[model samples]
Target: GSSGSSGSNFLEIDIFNPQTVGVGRARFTTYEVRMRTNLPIFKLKESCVRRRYSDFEWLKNELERDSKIVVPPLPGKALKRQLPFRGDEGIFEESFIEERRQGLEQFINKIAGHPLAQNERCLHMFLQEEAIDRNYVPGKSGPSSG
Candidate 1:
């Protein structure tokens, strides 16, 4: 089968445009996972979506539960200072944000590139949805479990 030779055989997801969206009076920091892809099979003629860290964690958990592949680690949690000291944890610091920014892309691309991993429903949902309701199960509608 020449299916493997066809560009449509695989999906292309590019995680880009990192942005920090703050919420609550405390200004909790949550980074957005902005992405765009050319997966025509998914009916995505250059579609883009934005997700958060919690969403990524959710996807990772579901994938780990349903798939046989090992999911890679995302960026580490930043240490927050309670007393408004220790440089305020800079929750919005540029370099720290940039570091995780790169990690997020690395993690996404790695899974997006894996043949089997690409089929994980959680992965597709994660990259495709602007927001996840947090209600999900595994091995039912994802990946070649087709």
Candidate 2:
């Protein structure tokens, strides 16, 4: 169904049931993305992992690069403000945290559930990483963009 009406058996990356699994630090917080999957036919299984917002950005960038999927935008980008300046709760504000959490979840859910991105090597490296081992950089793994 998600792969169009052709009835082809392309794999899926069903990432769902997002719960706030981990805790935040002093200023920088993180999330534990516990997801279920259909790509386990390629060994991607239902499990949990921790990641920061930047990790999501990296995943988005890399997947969009080779997979040819139009990944959705993520949260945590401060457009009109510059951190917590005066009387503001700053970067670690509760509302901001929850907002970012939801946004990040949406970003992941979209990227993971896409049919085109399912078989990409970068996507596999992304979801399969068991630790804080992955990151998003410009041409992060392939070449230097300088």
Candidate 3:
């Protein structure tokens, strides 16, 4: 059985379903980051992970410090909304969250699709690993448990 074919390697990532959790000062939003890839650099071919905006920031920071490629920018922090006594929906607004989701999706796709990013430890963890250890040593992936 000689079925040999090699052409294009693809990596697809989608960020959606922004859901806000907790209440008051502790409230935070999380997006579902789903990835589908044929690249062996990733331990999991297909993976879905829920991550907050801070996680995306972490990824960008890591790439900037390590990866050779220029990292894409993430959506704005929307710091103005976090102000006190804002008579508006603020960051929890449906429209605002959706916009952020779109930006995040764009950001991840660029990182995942880049040849240099595919080999990055943080990038792989961002897509496939269940929990991200912010204190993890650079140049190493999280420990795999069976």
Candidate 4:
């Protein structure tokens, strides 16, 4: 038997390009999310989107409310960095941004590969949609029964 990691379905995602944007009072970093998959649930075989940290938060909350899967936790909120202590970039630091990027990459890969999450509409939107609709109607359920 020739065995070497073979699966019918395959999915791989990459979160990179942590670029900070906006002005002094309202600056934020965005990560480029790239998805490569053979899953039928996804509309695009390859998709790329630039999303801010808040969008990940939105996805987390959406999954928790819409699905039965035990969603994974995101990176720390990093609230302490906002406090003015030293005169230097805190959350805006290159190191911090890179760390968050890895954390985000891991966070997405977990949900992306999860069996239950594969069928979630919000997950599809999060990974593929260019814009998120917070008030979006929950679409039809997956073609399966418990």
Best by TM-score: 4
Q: Pick the candidate with the highest lDDT.
A: 4
Query: Could you give candidate 4's per-residue lDDT for residues 1-146 as a string of tens digits?
Result: 98655467778788887787776744678988998888667768888988976788988888788557878999865465666753334345667777778888888888788888888888878878878888788755455465
Alpha-carbon shift of residue 75 in model 3 (angstroms): 1.1
Write one digit per residue (lDDT tens) for candidate 2, span 1-146: 46523343343333334344344533466666766554333464455666667677777787667545778877754446667553324445567767777777777667666756655546656656645344433233322232
Per-model C-alpha lDDT, please? 0.61, 0.57, 0.76, 0.78
Q: Tally clashes: model 2.
A: 2
**Which consecutive 10 residues in model 4 have the weakest lDDT in total?**
85-94
TM-score of 3: 0.76
- C-alpha displacement of 94 in model 2, angstroms? 2.1
Checking candidate 3 for backbone clashes, the offending pairs are none
lDDT of 3 by residue, 1-146 (tens): 88855567878888887777777754678888889877666777788889877788988888899546888988874466666665335445677777778888888888777766777787877878869887777653434331
Which residues of candidate 3, in runs, are more than 4 Å off?
A: 1-8, 77-89, 137-146
Q: What does candidate 1's lDDT look like per residue over 1-146, in tens digits?
A: 55422344444455556665555443434454544455543434444677655567778777678557878887876566677545333355667656766677788767777756666566666766566656665444432434
Better of 2 and 3 by TM-score: 3
Candidate 4, lDDT over the whole model:
0.78
Per-model TM-score, in order, reads 0.65, 0.60, 0.76, 0.78
